[PDB]
From a paper:
In particular, RORγt, whose activity is required for the proliferation and functionality of immune Th17 cells, is the subject of intense investigation to modulate its activity to achieve clinical benefit. NRs are characterized by the ability to bind small ligands at a highly conserved hydrophobic orthosteric-binding pocket located within the protein's ligand-binding domain (LBD). Helix 12 (H12, also called activation function-2, AF-2) can adopt distinct conformations in response to ligand binding, regulating the interaction of the LBD with cofactor proteins with resulting changes in gene transcription at a particular locus. Here we characterize the mode of action of these inhibitors to guide an optimization program and surprisingly find a novel binding mode, thereby identifying the first allosteric-binding pocket for a highly potent, cellular active small NR ligand.
To elucidate the molecular basis of RORγt modulation by MRL-871, we performed co-crystallization studies with an equimolar complex of RORγt-LBD and MRL-871. Co-crystals grew in two different space groups. Crystals in space group P6122 had unit cell dimensions of a=b=108.5, c=104.7 Å, diffracted to 2.2 Å resolution and also contain one molecule per asymmetric unit. The overall structures from both sets were identical in all the features and the ligand conformation. MRL-871 binds instead to a previously unidentified allosteric pocket in the RORγt LBD, located distal to the classical binding site (orange). Crystal structure analysis shows that this allosteric pocket, absent in the classical NR-folding motif, is formed by helices 4, 5, 11 and the reoriented flexible H12. Hydrogen-bonding interactions exist between the molecule's carboxylic acid group and the side chain of RORγt residue Q329 as well as the main-chain amide hydrogen atoms of residues A497 and F498. The unique conformation induced by the binding of MRL-871 prevents interaction with cofactor peptides, which typically bind RORγt through a conserved LXXLL motif, at the AF-2. MRL-871, however, effectively antagonizes the RORγt coactivator peptide recruitment interaction, independent of cholesterol concentration. In contrast, the inverse agonist T0901317 competes for the same binding site as cholesterol, resulting in a competitive displacement and a cholesterol concentration-dependent increase of the IC50 value for T0901317; that is, RORγt binding and inhibition by T0901317 becomes less potent in the presence of agonistic ligands. Together, these data demonstrate that the allosteric inhibition of coactivator binding to RORγt by MRL-871 is both potent and independent of orthosteric site occupancy.
Author numbering: 267 to 507
Write the structure that this text describes.
Amino acid sequence: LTEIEHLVQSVCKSYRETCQLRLEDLLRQRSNIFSREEVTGYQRKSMWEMWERCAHHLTEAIQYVVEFAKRLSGFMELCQNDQIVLLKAGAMEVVLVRMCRAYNADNRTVFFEGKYGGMELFRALGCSELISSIFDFSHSLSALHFSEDEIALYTALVLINAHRPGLQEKRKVEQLQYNLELAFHHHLHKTHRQSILAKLPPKGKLRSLCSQHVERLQIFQHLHPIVVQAAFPPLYKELFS
Ligand SMILES: O=C(O)c1ccc(-c2nn(C(=O)c3c(Cl)cccc3C(F)(F)F)c3ccccc23)cc1
């Protein structure tokens, strides 16, 4: 009946609503794998057509994350500057965590455009180092067998973090962070899943992967810019110069 147990239900709701695909849909489609003809078709496409495809899927992913943040109790109550600071540093980190749901650790494939395919699908992009890192991060995260409420609460904490440089009302972020930590700890105790806390990825790993990802995305956006209808215009202008 506590203010925290509600916070749990509310975070789980925002997440359920901003969830692009349902987990059992992703799990059942684990059989639906791209054929060598389909893989070759992706590999033979231009760098620029594979880029427009991936950039549009990644922008859509960020927009679901912005909506997940918007629906978190207290997020709107922060000043616009703090909202930008938190989403600029964390939105893509959330997108990267969420990918573990579309990842199949057995055949090392990811759900991309209706079917499951390996990293070979992305050859055309010519950044096999970054793509291998993304797949390796999803592969490590998959061993935790994250549940839907775990991903929800963990991703809310990835976003609500008072240790992001440039925050104005720092104590207002701390107040939201500490409530979400309590919700996360409380929830893990209730379900006997406190063991995942020791297995969680180090804060630096995520931060590092994401900065590399976003810089590679920024280079591609400079060379071949895609156009997106901004869900959060002040955030969009902070990433798209
Ligand atoms: O709809 C919006 O308001 C919105 C929509 C998307 C963002 C956003 N894009 N982004 C990218 O990395 C990105 C993507 Cl996903 C595709 C193509 C180019 C880019 C790049 F130019 F920024 F590099 C981000 C990283 C971190 C945080 C927010 C965002 C921001 C706002």
